[PDB]
Amino acid sequence: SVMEDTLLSVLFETYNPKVRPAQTVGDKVTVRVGLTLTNLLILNEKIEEMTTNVFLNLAWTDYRLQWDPAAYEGIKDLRIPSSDVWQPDIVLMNNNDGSFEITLH
């Protein structure tokens, strides 16, 4: 889609994903953290470990990813690789392995 390419080129000209979105210095970003459990696999008691397959449900607002859909053929929503936007480092702290971050991006 040519409007999608144009819109992505626009949004991500000067957009840096290392930068936390604060339209005004001092603002806080509001992140909503939910969890969808898909399976409780194992609760091995010999090592005190708990294995789950879960979807995290994160939501936040990046003031930089805004646009008028009337200017882009009514595109009201985009699916963008996670590596291209700023995302908070929401991780499992109480892991027993060393895998803080998610698996499927």
Among 16, 23, 24, 38, binds another protein (CB under 8 A): 38
Strands 51-59 and 32-42: antiparallel
Which amino acid does the sequence have at 20?
Answer: R
Are 80 and 58 a contacting pair, CB within 8 Å? no
What is the rounded radius of gyration, in angstroms, for the C-alpha atoms of the chain?
18
Verify binding: residue 66, another protein, rule CB under 8 A. no
The reply on whether position 39 binds another protein by CB under 8 A is yes
Question: Could you say whether residue 5 binds another protein (CB under 8 A)?
Answer: yes
Among positions 47, 81, 93, 94, the unique one binding another protein when judged by CB under 8 A: 81
Please tell me whether residue 35 binds another protein under the rule CB under 8 A.
Answer: no
41 binds another protein (CB under 8 A): yes
Beta bridge partners of 77: none
* CA 65/CA 78 separation, integer angstroms: 10
Chain residues that interact with another protein, rule: CB under 8 A: 1-5, 8, 38-39, 41-42, 53, 73-75, 77, 79-81, 84, 99, 103-104
